[PDB]
Amino acid sequence: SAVWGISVYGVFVLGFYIAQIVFSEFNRMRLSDWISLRPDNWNATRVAVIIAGYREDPFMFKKCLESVRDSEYGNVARLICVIDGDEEEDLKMAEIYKQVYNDNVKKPGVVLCESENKNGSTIDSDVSKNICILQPHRGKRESLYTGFQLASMDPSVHAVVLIDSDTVLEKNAILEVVYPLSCDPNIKAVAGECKIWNTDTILSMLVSWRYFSAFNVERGAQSLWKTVQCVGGPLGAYTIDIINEIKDPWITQTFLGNKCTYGDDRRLTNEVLMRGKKIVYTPFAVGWSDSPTNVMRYIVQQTRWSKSWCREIWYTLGSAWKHGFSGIYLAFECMYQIMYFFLVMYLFSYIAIKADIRAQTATVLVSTLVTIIKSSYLALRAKNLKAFYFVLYTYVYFFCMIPARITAMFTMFDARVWLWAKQFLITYMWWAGVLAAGVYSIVDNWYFDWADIQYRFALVGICSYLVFVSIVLVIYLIGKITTWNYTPLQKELIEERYLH
Amino acid sequence: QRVEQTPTTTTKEAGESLTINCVLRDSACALDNTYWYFTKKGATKKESLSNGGRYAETVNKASKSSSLRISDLRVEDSGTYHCKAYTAGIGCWNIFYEGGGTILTVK
Ligand SMILES: [Mn+2]
């Protein structure tokens, strides 16, 4: 029973990972072949980039605008800056934008989304100059919409690169996202690889490699299938046309009859998928973005992401059939996600109930082997040795992703104590439950038998796992002390933050 | 890379036919197909035109050129005509190319 379950879990996970690996490598090969025939100094596409931000750090915002200006694309029509502010505090963002770009900033009283006239000609009159908008804090979608209008306004705009305020971009990243689709008209969106630069904390570091994997595997695979389930907030491209075609629908997304004021990422992408358009992802385009460093903020962010995912899965499946042959992989992927979560939960429940030391030793060993294989692949792919830190991702996944999943599922339907509870009470109950299972197992197996070969194997395995985790923690600590694990960009970021 | 609506201005009597050509120039990318838009004088809204009725559009792929033959012109046909070019293929971006426009006056 337990041996069969572990065996199928290991084979299933490794098989799916290997399939995703070969799919992503094929996608990368196709992208490289496509780039190989790109004419030099190619600037055929006119692009209007879009920024959206709210209460962003002034230094990070300044660096983002510096990167945007420093981009080497020679066919950028204009920069559209949208900030849901209309508040004295938000004027800092306007000042930062003024010190980098044209001083002109317009502050309309009224939001285009709630306006009876959604054309931007009410708020804008010139398209040549870069324009910054200050509007009442509505949230996300709206702001983007504003920009969308302002973009479409300019006909030349053939595509719109959407970038988050907190995002460092590369001169090439632009052409790098505004070119893939040249190859295939159908491509109506290009997901741009994003990278977590803040890696000081082990969490950030782990998340960094997590991002790495995600973008360069799943995304890549789906990209091969021209069906990247989701675009990239920090770095994302979008054909102006499909945008104009999805902006309004997406701007008006209500789940259970409730404007979904959550992750826009996914909804517009889901609309594009409903239209049957192909979405490809390129890894050659990189954008540096920060990551949460606090466990609680990571928990709430992952909970919001899980809510968006669960809300968008129904529509994703409902539209997957429109891709005919294609899309089958997308259905397989979502079914894999649900069945993998359910299998992990059931396996942990069985482990807690049975409390068989051999079983726990076996699952620990196979999980370590899986993480070792994944980290080895990641190191080989990135030509970088710090990818082995991903073996600790099991801890953070178990202790954060699962409670976030349960929180999202429980909070989908139906003073400060309550609100605080709705965020962390699931996580605290989960941690208490795992601790209780651990102590119950350890007392239920409170015996020693050196004459038992199975007991000896379990003990040596658990000791080896402990020393392995300890040495990984030690090497991480010394790397942090010598600041070797810092990302290359973080060094000069700290330099000009200090010199300020 | 530019598009030229050669006959960009013209004034002609009612009850004749007019031909407006749309050519994509300086492009290494092959033309995919052409969309034609109309704006009524005074009005700014653009209205898309379709094959049929008095509108007959001919698309040439080898020369990357297209032309709209509008026949049997009435007074309300007076307005600015715009061609909207498309490029496609492998490594060829799906682009909108808007020509200079052709203002037509029908008396
Ligand atoms: Mn930020």
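^ manganese (II) ion complex. The CA atoms of residues 101 and 130 of chain A lie 8 Å apart. The pocket of manganese (II) ion is lined by residues A 56-57, 60, 166, 290 (CB under 6 Å).
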